[model samples]
Target chain A: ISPNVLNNMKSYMKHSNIRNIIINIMAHELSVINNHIKYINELFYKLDTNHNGSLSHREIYTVLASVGIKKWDINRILQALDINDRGNITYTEFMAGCYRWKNITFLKAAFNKIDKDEDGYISKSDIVSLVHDKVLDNNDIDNFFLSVHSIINKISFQEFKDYMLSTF
Target chain B: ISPNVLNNMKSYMKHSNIRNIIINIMAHELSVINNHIKYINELFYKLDTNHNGSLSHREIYTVLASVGIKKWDINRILQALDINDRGNITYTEFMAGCYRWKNITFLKAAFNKIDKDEDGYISKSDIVSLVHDKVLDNNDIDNFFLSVHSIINKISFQEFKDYMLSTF
Candidate 1:
């Protein structure tokens, strides 16, 4: 939602060559979910090529390969999607896959200077700064944290679910 | 790649533009499926300008204009990449511009909170750092801190990449 990304997307929206890149992603995302659709099973089958009942690591590879990927690329794709590591992907997993590039997740990965302690999570203040993309100061940080606390205090699983639903 | 997407890429990724957008994108990643490649290509086109196409945001204003962007939107794009707010963008920041968009998923936003120490990964230290981010109540505070201690610096890019990468 930042302006530059918006600009980049606007560029994508315009250029004929890159246009389908967005369209394909949107389509690929749609292909997986949308429970009410008629071809859901068929599309899932397409994603689940080599369908061994449901999605498995190898089956995922088959689909990847079938869709212009080769054997060697399986792990990379798996690495991108396997969040909790039960090793089988569900509809939620599938939707999660829909937007790998949608978030700023990868941006953090490209950084070098972190106030990293032994365990490595950034602090409350640090996270607030990140949200502001480091634009806010102490007062800004305090206000943001207070706002977050007011909205949702704890980050336990249930709270997280509630938080997301409330945001929706 | 889907023909439509391939066509889109034709619009998006010029030979030069494609390399700039994708060079750092670990080539070994399995996640880089046809759609992945195609989408990246599209993202490139969206960001690149002039068909002369070595993407640079040297003059944030001109770059915005080149991409058919509104003048008012210039600062936001500049902010994401212009760490110093110098009005110009660095390459890494430019990529940040590429990574964000309206259709953009909160892809990385979910895990954005987990990296506490500012260390890139979600190491044990990060989990400890997590308590700092939220309103940790007395009941969960002890366990939360314990989890932090348990994993701080314990995780690594190779070890935890899959665990959180999907959040994107």
Candidate 2:
């Protein structure tokens, strides 16, 4: 995600309205996929060497390895995409998986950006800085902080990611 | 789930631009969840009677059964919600699961609506009526039909759902 998009997302989150924020984030992510839809389709066709309309694990591994994706990460990606445990990815599965990967990557990057101190956790002060300089009309900042604190005083990346995904 | 929302989705699909259409549909669906977020939270809290911040299989079954959800369907819902296979649903999982359920339900309803003849499949003519009376500026109708035909002469609900999901 670009700084502009990240900043926009942070701004949306500051409102403490999960629906609008989630919808905004999803729209931005989907636009990225739309812009690259043609390329993605061509990639799928090229990777489907067998003309079987699906990409086998071996096919995916070859491409990911060639692109220098780490072996462990490649395996993990494959597992996540193969929702049915079928050892292969249909075109539909591939597209949905791509969206999921993009969303997850953005979430990770956002968490890192918010963590700021490289502490692997986001403290209240971290959130304070995140919402700083932005005008919150409803002044939901206190409520938002209270909600986060109620869940956990210091939020881990896993918790942050889960909370964001849950809003979907 | 309402006729108005379904009509809005159909109109969006008529544009044949997958990205914008998907974003619109998702926004509508998210709005539905957002409209009921408080109720959903309350439901989760009530379901998690033990105060453990999670709902077990038994707890879910009891509530779902009370609501007249079919036994088999309830099991499927539980399995889908338990993404981690941990035999419980956390607050985050519950919310995500609800969103997914809403989306899937909308898709199924849309499919049924489009399959006007109740033939269990969507033919080219079916799609024609779906896009009928709507103005498509790019006139990509033929291309869209060809793409659908290329994949399958008669598109089943599964195929339609998969294609829609693939657009992500």
Candidate 3:
């Protein structure tokens, strides 16, 4: 690309655009969190024989252990999540605690990393490769990038399916 | 200063020192958060008429308005804080929710802004002028600077009282 064209591409970035992208990503993550909460509810019910809409500390520990999550910090997590301090986790508390940063800080941190030029466009280049935690493959990466791009640009909606499928 | 010492001073600075300073600031903010939590609990109790250990959506707005915080996005704030979704804020929820980024992300953002030198000293020169939100006067600023400097240098603790007193 010519120097002028390159500069144009760089300057097209805006913090507002990045903010919009973050909102979109957050909405998507909230949906994912809802699904995760559903799964967690099943696990919670399995251990919560009492059905008091809250899990005892023992129930929480058992659920975490069964799910292969470390129970070492279970007490601290419970303390943080149990608003009533009934020494138990309510359904809402369980979901929120587990998905604490799924939408907000996690996305903010990712957005900070993704805005490589610091211009804040959150362009395709910013997000495509580094999303290993969600475990997207190379093909998944390209398709996901294209779908996000399409949404942001107000293009085709068909790519939505590809992105949603990859997300789950 | 001699040229050699000038170079030495410049060279002595490292990203690690800055990182250390940020961690120090975060630790201090966590203490501040504790104090903020204490104050918020008082406010929460005053507004919690039902004393069900929770505040309804309207109660939260009333508290924020009373505290001089604009209710521009009170709904969003309420949604984020009210995990139980019984449409109310519990004590633990109120404390944790109010201080979500109050101690962590907000400080990180400010520290990033203040450390223009990127050496992370966060000297009086870095922070004294820009803290408009808290309305720190020059004397308070100087006192705060000295306290931070003393703590970071492993020197004295006498200044801590002044800084803490001025914060409220």
Top model by TM-score, which number? Answer: 1
Rank list by lDDT: 2, 3, 1
The C-alpha local distance difference test score for the whole of candidate 3 amounts to 0.45
Candidate 1 lDDT, B103-142, residue by residue in tens: 2323233344445555666554554444443343355434
**DockQ score for model 3, please?**
0.02
Q: What docking grade applies to model 2?
A: incorrect
Model 1 spans > 4 angstroms off: A1-115, A118-122, A125-136, A150-168, B1-60, B100-168
Per-residue lDDT of model 3, residues A1-168, tens digit only = 123322221222211222223333443433343444445556567768888877888876665556444554554545544544567656554543432221224345445555666665554555553443333346644554565555462212234333332332
Candidate structures ordered by TM-score, highest first: 1, 2, 3
Interface RMSD of the predictions, in order shown? 17.8, 19.3, 21.4
Look at candidate 1 and tell me the lDDT of residue B114.
Answer: 49
TM-score quality measure for candidate 1: 0.30
Better of 2 and 3 by lDDT: 2
Give the per-residue lDDT digits (tens) of candidate 3, residues B1-168: 123322222222211222223323433443344444445556668778778877888876775556544555455556555544557656555543432221124344445656666664455656543444433457755554555554353212234323322322
lDDT, candidates in the order shown: 0.39, 0.55, 0.45
TM-scores of all predicted structures? 0.30, 0.28, 0.26
For model 3, name the residue pairs that clash.
none
Q: Model 1, A1-168: lDDT tens per residue?
A: 245455454443332211222223333333232221223334456666556545767666665566675454456545434433558855434433432231322113211122233233334544443445434456654543354345532233233223223322
